[PDB]
Amino acid sequence: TQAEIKLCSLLLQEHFGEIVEKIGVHLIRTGSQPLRVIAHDTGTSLDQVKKALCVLVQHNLVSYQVHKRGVVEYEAQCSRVLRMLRYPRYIYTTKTLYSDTGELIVEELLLNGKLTMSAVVKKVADRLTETMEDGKTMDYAEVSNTFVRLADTHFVQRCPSVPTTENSDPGPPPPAPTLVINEKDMYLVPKLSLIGKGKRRRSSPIPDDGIYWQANLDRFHQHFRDQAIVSAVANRMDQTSSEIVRTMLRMSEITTSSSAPFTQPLSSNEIFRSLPVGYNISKQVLDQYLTLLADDPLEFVGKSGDSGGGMYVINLHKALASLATATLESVVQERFGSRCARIFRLVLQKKHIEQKQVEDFAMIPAKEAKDMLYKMLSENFMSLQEIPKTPDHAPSRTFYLYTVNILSAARMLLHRCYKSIANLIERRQFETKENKRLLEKSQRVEAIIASMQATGAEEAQLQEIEEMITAPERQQLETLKRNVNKLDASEIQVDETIFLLESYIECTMKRQ
Amino acid sequence: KEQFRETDVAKKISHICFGMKSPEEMRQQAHIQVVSKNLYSQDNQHAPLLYGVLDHRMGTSEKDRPCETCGKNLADCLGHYGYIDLELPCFHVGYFRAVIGILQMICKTCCHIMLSQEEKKQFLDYLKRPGLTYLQKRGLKKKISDKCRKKNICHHCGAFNGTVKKCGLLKIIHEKYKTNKKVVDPIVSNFLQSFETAIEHNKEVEPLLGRAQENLNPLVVLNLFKRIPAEDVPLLLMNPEAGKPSDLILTRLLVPPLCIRPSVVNEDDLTMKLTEIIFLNDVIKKHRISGAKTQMIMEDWDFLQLQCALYINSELSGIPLNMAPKKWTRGFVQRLKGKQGRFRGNLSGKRVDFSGRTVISPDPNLRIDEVAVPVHVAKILTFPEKVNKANINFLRKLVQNGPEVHPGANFIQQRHTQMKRFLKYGNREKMAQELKYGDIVERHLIDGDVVLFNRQPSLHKLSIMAHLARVKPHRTFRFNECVCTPYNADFDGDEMNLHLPQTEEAKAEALVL
Amino acid sequence: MEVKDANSALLSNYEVFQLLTDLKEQRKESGKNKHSSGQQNLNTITYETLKYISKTPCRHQSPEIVREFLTALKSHKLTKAEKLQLLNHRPVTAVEIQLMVEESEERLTEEQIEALLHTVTSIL
Amino acid sequence: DFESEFVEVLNQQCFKFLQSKAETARESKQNPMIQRNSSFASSHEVWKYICELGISKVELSMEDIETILNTLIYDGKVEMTIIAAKEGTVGSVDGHMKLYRAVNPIIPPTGLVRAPCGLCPVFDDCHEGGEISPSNCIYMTEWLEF
Amino acid sequence: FGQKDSVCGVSECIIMGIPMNIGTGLFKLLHKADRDPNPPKRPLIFDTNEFHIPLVT
Amino acid sequence: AAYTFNIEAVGFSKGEKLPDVVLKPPPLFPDTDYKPVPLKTGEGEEYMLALKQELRETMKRMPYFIETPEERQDIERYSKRYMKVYKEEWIPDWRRLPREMMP
Amino acid sequence: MFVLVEMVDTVRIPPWQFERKLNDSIAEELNKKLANKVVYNVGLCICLFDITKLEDAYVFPGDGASHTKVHFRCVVFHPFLDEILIGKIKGCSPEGVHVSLGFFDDILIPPESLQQPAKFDEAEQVWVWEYETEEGAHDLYMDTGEEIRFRVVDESFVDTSPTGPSSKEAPYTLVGSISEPGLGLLSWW
Amino acid sequence: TEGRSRDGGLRLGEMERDCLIGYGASMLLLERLMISSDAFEVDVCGQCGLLGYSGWCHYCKSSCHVSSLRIPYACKLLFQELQSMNIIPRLKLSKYN
Ligand code: SF4
Ligand SMILES: [Mg+2]
Ligand SMILES: [Zn+2]
Ligand SMILES: [Zn+2]
Ligand SMILES: [Zn+2]
């Protein structure tokens, strides 16, 4: 995971600073370490180690346990640092499913890490004031009504809570309070009667104290997997079948695990009732749809039942295998061309094959077939087998069977995606560093135009910035801005490949 | 205008942290990329090519042609490296016994190490104590490989991990799909029936599909070793500051400079092996386009691995019979080991000059701290006496006597000039008038120079002492017979070595101690 | 060689003038030996640096001139590097103190700029 | 090989016919099960169509289009469904029938190939300070330009 | 393993060509030059602390 | 010249068409046939591009960003105090944090 | 534009100079070694200022010369960013106006920082500037080099060393601006 | 070289080195086994530990850490034979005093 350590170094250096990313990188790299050896093996002062560990544990980036003799051994989560990259997709999906208030709630959560309900609704009511005008203030109640709608839908959950020390070992305090996660009060919101209005930033005792809220990222990953399978069905069969699949996943939302090989079975009688009322459909056509999606060899659905008429399940691991296989063939198609993607799908479906068989099946000649075979061997997409005749394992006396294994190639593709995003972040930071002088000069001139713009802004000063020598390099500023915008957009859009690969590698594992 | 460069910093060397380079630091070390295969050009000029081996941007190996971006010579140039880009990765024949061990300790699927969290917490804490030596790390690697080889299932991904063992010269096999006489597991049952299209168009697959397992080639173990998390690397007992697990598979290869492989030995064996590695790289790069079979590709790849393995070590055991060398060549190990290698041959005891060897014969008329050096040896052995104020008038006479009369000199060196004017030619009375303070005159060995004196099987520390020499006409070293008891000399044709120290600190330490 | 401090103190050009003047006072009693090109480098850089400084307005100055100059200039809310340039260049008009002082038209009023010109011309 | 310059027109023409039939069946929109049954095209009807087009002088045998349609499937552009031959015009397969329908790919092209890092041929030689560095690449300088 | 080997021992001091610690290498010699440690400093005229109270509040 | 390995064990039973001797090393950046697929745009995909830039400009001003101090600065400038921004300091919940976190 | 730089160094005092007091010999040997050379990250050393601490004089084995570790300070031409200088013009170029500063030679003015009403030559060497009322397009930067006044806005360090196997660009390049009002030649303001 | 017919010169064996250790003659042993056999100046970079040339480390691309260092030629030959084998010796130089 050297690519993961490099990417986590870049993300911590961007979103927290330098003398915190040293601590984060060391905790990712070596592992469980007590507090004094984080100080000694890095070389920084102890107070900076304390501030860095507190700002990491605030955002739920490092965990801590209690061990023998009373030591506190910290430990960073590499996956939680990597999920800092998907924050604009989280803020966009909460703006999609909800209002701007639900956008700003998840924004304040992902930015502060842990907040109470009162603090986050105060900050949302404060920040909605700039979005409004003409005397209308935002109030706490309608923000809280969206906050409880998020808490009901489980996008937002409560942090693991402190134990009651009057009931749990009264006496001397332990070195660490030993937080425990309670399954009960995750989504039980504390009631609030305190209402108020947001300040307009003029520049001229807490009931839910200790109850902190964090964004539940696993629910966002479940919603993203839902949208992935829904768009897969929407691109294969039809829009109505896609809406039926969306309805089945919506009914499968609150009733199953985020990591389960098969979800709850659904009776078609309640699939019919759960559809939004805009569709003119019958029971029999719905039965046809379900039994023709069960006819699919991609098998997104399974029968798994006979009682109650139409009993239907949706598949999770087979659907994620189909999506990961589509990603793995899409990258081969775009890297080598269509005639090589043909060979990749051929070696995929026929599970084992030889060269003459590829040349016969694929309608691709010699010196162009084997060329693409060997290019895909040099990139770890396609494994050999070498069934041996003798135990000498000599190449002269054996048969070589091409083989595509989806798991190792998906891990390889994930390893390439991490290093890809790391390289894009490198290029963005290099361009900003080499043009920071013109950047700060532009900051100066926009601070000049910004000051007294509302009052007494003569038109002559607008020409005096254009008369200034920044105007030959406004071409360079536009080039820098479009380059930074394209690199940030690509840094966003590689995460769609990362999530579809990471879901498959996550679901093929048992953790026993 | 001119950049401040000075290096007379006078640090001494302290300790030598061994390690290994990644393939992408070899690119940062080397100067040229060796891609060509012919040594010298075609014509009569006999000059080497521009991007092959024997390129003189890798230093020089002859007095004629200097190092080709400066104008300074063979005697000063360290030599410089070039790198060969291998087309397909190969195992290193030295690190292969460690590649097997790393593969036996980690999961072959998710690339974590197969241990419980508690045993990792045990061994990582045992790696924290001070005073951890190399004996202790050698024990701890076996104690962790034992608890890794007793597990068959992964505690992290859940997949199965069979035994990994060496199945010959530079091949690694992994038994993932072992069978039993019991109820067949699903994970082996799917793999046994996955051979459908191979069974359809071939007959002999069907008996041989029981012996099929996972073949680990460098294309796969280089892929695996890139995914080992850096938390799990010290449990493989590697210091991650001195090496990485990805570095044990070579995919780029340094070539030694010309001062390590002399072009007139014609060419050294390492130059031939590097030429053959470049040739096999071109052969595979052409057969990836010309559509040769997998038999020819894998055979050539095996050759690429066998040539690198013979490049590093030319005494392998399990060499296949159609691929062995015809002649015996010095690899790097065979120019390290042996009786005439680097260590035992050149580091431990090395030959010295300013020495002599003559038969001894007795002479009691000398004092006990004098040895009588013959004239025909004292005209050859010289001591460099720097000119100063006390002995200018002595060294003018010893320059005027030349190299043939005995109290004379053989050379002369100017102050800030390192060239030695040999003192036979030139009107020597002109060179005797041009002596400045600080010139170095290599005078003959005269009466009173400290010289060392040694009988060859050196039992105790008085087998080598220092006498004050005196020159005498006959051809034997003549010392007093009272000194025969330390040397255990016997005057029956015995020879005793002479050593003349060349530095005033060496004279004084010899004379006092 | 090793640098403990790349920027330890700023220097007026009068200190460097006095340094090269005192270096000239004890030099050239024993000529170069042609044993190294170090004396050639020292002679050229000392000579040419003193020849450049000898056409600057840092000649005819003294220690106590700089003392009273910083004394009279202390009460004007200026930086170190601005007082350095004002000491070195001897400005005589107002167009160049607009250059040597950053945000001249925003910190310094025109009467303060004229008082600054008078303060500079009154001492040097 | 039969010919590599010749299959390049059949692999497009069969896809045009299948996409035309899927277009007509989609614009039918009467009964979606009946629409899906009308989406399946016969293995024999497509042979009768291509041989009626008559681009080659050599006669296009049915067993040859039986493998030409495999290259249509293996490019990920059509499926294949095997049913029993209860009813059939010819019955080229004894007791069974082969059907083909024009499909679309499952997902858009992935986000990895949108960045030029996903298509690099020297990807394993790129590091921060080396020769091939992201701060001085050519593929990004071409990619960031237009 | 990357095990770092010292060159404090005698035999590797003989190999690496550095003078060893036994014998006439246990101590260090100093020259008794006519020297003056901590000589008087040339005065700074411009940059002292008394003339340069900082600008920012 | 002849080799240590037999060429016949590699191939070349005719003994001709040996792979050519390369004069110049290949260039650092080989020309690729293919290009990246152009990016996805839209009214939803563009909002993430602006929100991601808002995250940098916000989190650099938040108190969680531990500033690195300025070091060995050459001169102090009046344009320097335009750069320096004082910021209020957050306080950790000491009940959730262990005891050794206290300064 | 001159700074003190506190440096430490080992000074090899040869043994024929033992008759002379050590402080004078250290100053002589450091002036023979640091003068007129560009130290990589601090600038151009003019001459020694003083010696501030002088440690003990070791004698290393194999050499009779006494080495000693010297704490000293040295004056260095290192003009900080946004600083006004005056200097002569050496010559004009298609890349810009090469400005001499007495002892120091490589101060380049780019065309993008020249004064904006004229930025181009008529395939002539000498760079020009145009004002409408007087001296239209015939004003010029004379190669005799009357004193101009510029403003350094960039400095660059390259580590000029023999790149490649062994055994002329300037290591201290300095780029200024002239485009501000009041700068340029001293004859213009 | 080796023998009398090549005008070769004698051999400080493995036993005369021991006898010179026994006297404590440090500089004589240094002079014999380095200066009168094979003297050679390398330049070792102090940061990366690799060898360089002319006060310039090609690896790091800098001149601010290299040091002059007297070394036998057999030792440099050993170090370059080891770097060719991808066993890297990284010479961490401390200091005098
Ligand atoms: S950094 Fe450059 S060379 Fe490396 S993957 Fe990206 S585009 Fe390719
Ligand atoms: Mg005898
Ligand atoms: Zn060279
Ligand atoms: Zn495990
Ligand atoms: Zn280095």
Side-chain angles (χ1 to χ4, degrees), chain H residues 70-97:
Chain H
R70 301 279 290 166
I71 197 167
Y73 189 81
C75 181
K76 191 268 294 178
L77 175 58
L78 180 64
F79 285 165
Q80 289 182 354
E81 287 178 357
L82 287 182
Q83 291 190 6
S84 297
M85 291 165 66
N86 199 2
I87 296 173
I88 299 298
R90 297 176 188 271
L91 305 177
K92 180 171 172 61
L93 276 72
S94 68
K95 204 166 75 175
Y96 65 102
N97 64 7

Side-chain angles (χ1 to χ4, degrees), chain A residues 423, chain D residues 116-117 120 123 126 132 134 137 139-140:
Chain A
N423 291 319
Chain D
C117 303
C120 178
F123 182 78
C126 174
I132 308 165
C137 175
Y139 302 112
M140 286 188 183

Side-chain angles (χ1 to χ4, degrees), chain B residues 18-21 26 81 91-96 247-248 250 252-257 260 270 308-314 331-337 342-343, chain H residues 77-89:
Chain B
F18 286 96
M20 63 185 73
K21 277 180 181 176
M26 292 181 180
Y81 295 96
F91 283 116
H92 197 284
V93 80
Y95 295 110
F96 187 76
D247 304 336
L248 286 84
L250 59 88
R252 188 174 292 116
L253 182 63
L254 289 177
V255 302
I260 313 299
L270 294 175
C308 292
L310 288 167
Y311 174 74
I312 296 165
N313 192 1
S314 178
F332 281 117
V333 174
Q334 292 88 24
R335 64 191 287 164
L336 289 178
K337 66 179 283 183
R342 293 291 172 267
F343 297 97
Chain H
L77 175 58
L78 180 64
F79 285 165
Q80 289 182 354
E81 287 178 357
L82 287 182
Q83 291 190 6
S84 297
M85 291 165 66
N86 199 2
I87 296 173
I88 299 298

Side-chain angles (χ1 to χ4, degrees), chain B residues 67-257:
Chain B
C67 185
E68 278 290 329
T69 317
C70 79
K72 292 195 289 184
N73 292 316
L74 173 142
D76 297 331
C77 187
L78 270 80
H80 303 87
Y81 295 96
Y83 66 98
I84 292 176
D85 293 331
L86 267 71
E87 294 293 326
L88 275 302
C90 299
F91 283 116
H92 197 284
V93 80
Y95 295 110
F96 187 76
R97 293 182 69 245
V99 177
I100 289 173
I102 295 168
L103 286 172
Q104 290 179 357
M105 289 183 284
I106 68 171
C107 177
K108 265 69 68 176
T109 299
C110 65
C111 296
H112 293 275
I113 184 169
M114 293 176 67
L115 290 176
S116 67
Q117 185 67 42
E118 294 295 326
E119 289 180 352
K120 294 180 187 180
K121 187 260 183 181
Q122 181 181 2
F123 288 117
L124 285 173
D125 285 333
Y126 187 75
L127 287 171
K128 295 295 188 293
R129 69 177 67 189
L132 188 66
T133 66
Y134 174 66
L135 172 62
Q136 298 175 357
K137 289 182 181 181
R138 280 187 285 114
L140 189 64
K141 183 177 181 291
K142 183 177 180 292
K143 285 185 283 187
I144 294 170
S145 68
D146 289 335
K147 292 180 183 177
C148 289
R149 288 175 67 187
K150 289 182 177 66
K151 293 182 175 66
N152 53 4
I153 61 170
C154 180
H155 297 284
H156 186 75
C157 71
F160 180 72
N161 293 320
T163 63
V164 176
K165 62 178 73 174
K166 184 172 89 274
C167 62
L169 185 67
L170 274 72
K171 291 184 178 68
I172 292 175
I173 195 167
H174 168 65
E175 287 93 3
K176 184 179 283 293
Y177 298 101
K178 63 179 289 294
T179 60
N180 291 317
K181 272 76 69 178
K182 63 185 288 184
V183 177
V184 177
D185 291 329
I187 193 165
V188 65
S189 72
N190 286 317
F191 178 70
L192 264 295
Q193 66 186 358
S194 64
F195 287 158
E196 181 177 0
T197 310
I199 295 169
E200 181 179 0
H201 294 82
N202 194 1
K203 184 175 88 274
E204 293 86 4
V205 175
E206 192 271 333
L208 291 173
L209 46 78
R211 272 75 175 174
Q213 293 298 323
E214 185 182 2
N215 285 312
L216 295 175
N217 54 358
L219 289 170
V220 169
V221 299
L222 179 59
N223 195 6
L224 294 174
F225 286 170
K226 287 182 181 178
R227 287 180 283 113
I228 295 173
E231 182 179 1
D232 294 330
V233 179
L235 294 173
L236 302 176
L237 271 301
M238 295 177 68
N239 190 0
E241 294 181 354
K244 290 186 288 184
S246 175
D247 304 336
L248 286 84
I249 284 93
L250 59 88
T251 183
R252 188 174 292 116
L253 182 63
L254 289 177
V255 302

